[PDB]
Design an enzyme around this catalytic site. Structure first.
Site, PDB file in Angstrom:
ATOM      1  N   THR A 117      72.965 -49.073 -53.231  1.00 54.42           N
ATOM      2  CA  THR A 117      72.919 -50.284 -54.058  1.00 54.42           C
ATOM      3  C   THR A 117      71.980 -50.141 -55.248  1.00 54.42           C
ATOM      4  OG1 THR A 117      71.127 -51.261 -52.772  1.00 54.42           O
ATOM      5  CG2 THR A 117      73.423 -51.704 -52.067  1.00 54.42           C
ATOM      6  N   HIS A 123      60.287 -50.197 -57.478  1.00 49.82           N
ATOM      7  CA  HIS A 123      61.574 -50.848 -57.190  1.00 49.82           C
ATOM      8  C   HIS A 123      61.577 -51.577 -55.883  1.00 49.82           C
ATOM      9  CE1 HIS A 123      63.036 -48.442 -60.538  1.00 49.82           C
ATOM     10  NE2 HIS A 123      62.787 -47.292 -59.845  1.00 49.82           N
ATOM     11  N   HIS A 176      63.196 -49.619 -46.548  1.00 51.58           N
ATOM     12  CA  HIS A 176      62.671 -50.471 -47.631  1.00 51.58           C
ATOM     13  C   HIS A 176      63.411 -51.790 -47.589  1.00 51.58           C
ATOM     14  CE1 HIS A 176      66.410 -48.641 -49.208  1.00 51.58           C
ATOM     15  NE2 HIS A 176      66.586 -49.902 -49.667  1.00 51.58           N
ATOM     16  N   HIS A 219      64.687 -55.630 -49.782  1.00 55.52           N
ATOM     17  CA  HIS A 219      65.139 -56.347 -51.035  1.00 55.52           C
ATOM     18  C   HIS A 219      64.962 -57.820 -50.778  1.00 55.52           C
ATOM     19  CE1 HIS A 219      67.380 -52.636 -52.348  1.00 55.52           C
ATOM     20  NE2 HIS A 219      67.641 -52.495 -51.066  1.00 55.52           N
ATOM     21  N   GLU A 272      70.988 -58.434 -50.221  1.00 57.30           N
ATOM     22  CA  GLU A 272      72.042 -57.779 -51.063  1.00 57.30           C
ATOM     23  C   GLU A 272      73.396 -58.146 -50.558  1.00 57.30           C
ATOM     24  OE1 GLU A 272      70.586 -53.511 -51.641  1.00 57.30           O
ATOM     25  OE2 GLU A 272      70.448 -54.642 -53.505  1.00 57.30           O
ATOM     26  N   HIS A 285      66.735 -52.116 -45.296  1.00 54.53           N
ATOM     27  CA  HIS A 285      67.615 -50.914 -45.191  1.00 54.53           C
ATOM     28  C   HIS A 285      66.892 -49.792 -44.578  1.00 54.53           C
ATOM     29  CE1 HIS A 285      70.119 -52.637 -48.763  1.00 54.53           C
ATOM     30  NE2 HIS A 285      70.447 -53.161 -47.612  1.00 54.53           N
TER      31      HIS A 285
HETATM   32  N1  LIG Z   1      69.382 -49.590 -51.139  1.00 55.93           N
HETATM   33  S1  LIG Z   1      70.181 -48.469 -50.407  1.00 55.93           S
HETATM   34  O1  LIG Z   1      69.853 -48.579 -48.917  1.00 55.93           O
HETATM   35  O2  LIG Z   1      71.592 -48.458 -50.776  1.00 55.93           O
HETATM   36  C1  LIG Z   1      69.432 -46.921 -50.936  1.00 55.93           C
HETATM   37  C2  LIG Z   1      68.308 -46.972 -51.852  1.00 55.93           C
HETATM   38  C3  LIG Z   1      67.680 -45.753 -52.225  1.00 55.93           C
HETATM   39  C4  LIG Z   1      68.129 -44.552 -51.644  1.00 55.93           C
HETATM   40  C5  LIG Z   1      67.549 -43.230 -52.005  1.00 55.93           C
HETATM   41  O3  LIG Z   1      67.919 -42.268 -51.330  1.00 55.93           O
HETATM   42  C6  LIG Z   1      66.727 -43.139 -53.248  1.00 55.93           C
HETATM   43  N2  LIG Z   1      66.503 -41.768 -53.671  1.00 55.93           N
HETATM   44  C7  LIG Z   1      65.296 -41.108 -53.493  1.00 55.93           C
HETATM   45  N3  LIG Z   1      65.376 -39.800 -53.915  1.00 55.93           N
HETATM   46  C8  LIG Z   1      66.656 -39.671 -54.367  1.00 55.93           C
HETATM   47  C9  LIG Z   1      67.282 -38.528 -54.927  1.00 55.93           C
HETATM   48  C10 LIG Z   1      68.634 -38.608 -55.325  1.00 55.93           C
HETATM   49  C11 LIG Z   1      69.344 -39.814 -55.155  1.00 55.93           C
HETATM   50  C12 LIG Z   1      68.717 -40.946 -54.606  1.00 55.93           C
HETATM   51  C13 LIG Z   1      67.358 -40.860 -54.210  1.00 55.93           C
HETATM   52  C14 LIG Z   1      69.151 -44.474 -50.779  1.00 55.93           C
HETATM   53  C15 LIG Z   1      69.864 -45.668 -50.382  1.00 55.93           C
HETATM   54 CL1  LIG Z   1      71.176 -45.545 -49.278  1.00 55.93          CL
HETATM   55 ZN   LIG Z   2      68.301 -50.838 -50.154  1.00 56.65          ZN
END
Ligand SMILES: NS(=O)(=O)c1ccc(C(=O)Cn2cnc3ccccc32)cc1Cl
Ligand SMILES: [Zn+2]
Ligand SMILES: NS(=O)(=O)c1ccc(C(=O)Cn2cnc3ccccc32)cc1Cl
Ligand SMILES: [Zn+2]
Lengths: 261, 261
Positions: free
Chosen positions: B196, B64, B89, B91, B102, B115
């Protein structure tokens, strides 16, 4: 009972309507990176759009927009089949944020948007049959900005207090539908997409005119306050506001323009 | 498993992850009509961001995004609870349409977005546990535009060729993660929203810095072209591009700003 807000809102429509999660969805943001001039996009002609003022056409609140039924003698000339009119309707925002067009241009919403839906009458007997089928529909979209009062749009808006609730119907004398189109209709964006409402079938040839039309703040306010998604006796009324879908990923499509600059 | 394209794309996330169709979804368009200066928004402090150059940090391609694991002694100070880092990470878009942030500002996408995810370690033991809980997560978002070569982003980007395919991993030596932040970090947007990506829980306190950073055209192209979503032996590879969520509706809400000017 799909909606634009809450559990049955747009991120959930694919649960009941698989094509809303499929490819070629509308609306989209029209921006330079994906625009390409196409000299073969010649002018459309609008035939049988000047409806007689002595005839009357059915206006209905369908629980999602307000729609005017149009006669099948009304058609677009210039596509590779004749597309005949079936209905027009609108999408809008709300009194505190009048920015409810569906398509955006370079990231910006217009105040509202008119869709005049046509179906391929060379191939199909009616729009409902055409809707889930190839080359079935063609929509003309007009971007609407807040500006001067528009007497032609008012031929529709002057009836809104008579179609306030889902299922209600009213008659609108005929008028010249072409008066709802903007200046320089020869300038348009063209692309393959989908209905912007469930069931979101990817069966629409979109034409978005380059130039907007204007209606006034008071016309927008009447549009944004007159109507309810719900029946007259519903004990959980829901205002018909913000009835536009967010823009969709492109899925590798370009948008072709009949104007080079 | 979820994707940003085809039938498992964002409009269908809510089938398996119901919060993707719920309240408080991110990302959103940050525009002037909805911004309000809040003097309560004091500068954050970034503590433990200067990662030991004698430690190594796992870079992964998870199908992803590209993710760098971060240590929990890295944290934000300035919020009511301590929020400890877990990962960063990015996007991004694609070379034909290099505008894959985003969040948007006044309707406009930036080229990409970083992020830095943190969790409330005063209340919860780890990010996974915090992710569906009240006050659980806090993200710092940096908007990225094309300009100058950025040596600090290259501390990540130079390892991209080692994590080309899903499941691949590389070790990155510690560096000062604060080098990835923009100028004048006291200037930010703040709102409550969600992840997101699935599961889209509405448990994130967002901080989007006002000012973007720059990376060169060649760095941006490398980020857009270096990675695949798919495992190396997948006979149908999918490039990792366009890995950003479309903006969500955000109505009757404010975004607070630490700046007025
Ligand atoms: N793109 S974003 O910054 O909004 C985001 C993207 C991914 C994650 C994660 O924490 C992914 N993730 C990784 N392990 C997880 C377990 C439960 C729920 C989510 C989990 C968190 C966030 Cl805040
Ligand atoms: Zn993100
Ligand atoms: N907003 S939009 O212009 O994209 C649109 C909105 C509604 C319709 C319809 O065709 C509505 N409709 C009319 N008959 C239908 C039969 C099945 C499903 C939908 C049907 C068509 C269109 Cl093109
Ligand atoms: Zn429509």
């Amino acid at each position: 009972k799909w909606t634009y807000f809450g559990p049955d809102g747009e991120n959930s429509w694919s649960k009941k309507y698989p094509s809303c999660g499929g490819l070629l969805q509308s609306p989209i943001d029209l921006h330079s990176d994906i625009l390409q001039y196409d000299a073969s996009l010649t002018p459309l002609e609008f035939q049988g759009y000047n409806l007689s003022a002595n005839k009357q056409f059915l206006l209905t609140n369908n629980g999602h927009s307000v729609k005017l039924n149009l006669p099948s003698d009304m058609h677009i000339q210039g596509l590779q089949s004749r597309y005949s009119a079936t209905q027009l309707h609108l999408h809008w925002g709300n009194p505190n944020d009048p920015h409810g067009s569906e398509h955006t241009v370079s990231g910006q919403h217009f105040a509202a948007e008119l869709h005049i839906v046509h179906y391929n009458s060379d191939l199909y007997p009616d729009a409902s049959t055409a809707s889930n089928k190839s080359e079935g529909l063609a929509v003309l979209a007009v971007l609407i900005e807040m500006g001067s009062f528009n007497p032609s749009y008012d031929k529709i808006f002057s009836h809104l207090q008579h179609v306030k609730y889902k299922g209600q119907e009213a008659f609108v004398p005929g008028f010249n539908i072409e008066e709802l189109l903007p200046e320089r209709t020869a300038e348009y964006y063209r692309y393959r997409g989908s209905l912007t409402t469930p069931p979101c079938n990817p069966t629409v040839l979109w034409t978005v005119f380059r130039n907007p039309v204007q209606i006034s703040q008071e016309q927008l306010l009447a549009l944004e306050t007159a109507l309810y998604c719900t029946h007259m006796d519903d004990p959980s009324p829901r205002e018909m506001i913000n009835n536009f879908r967010q823009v969709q990923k492109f899925d590798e499509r370009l948008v072709y323009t009949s104007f080079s600059q």
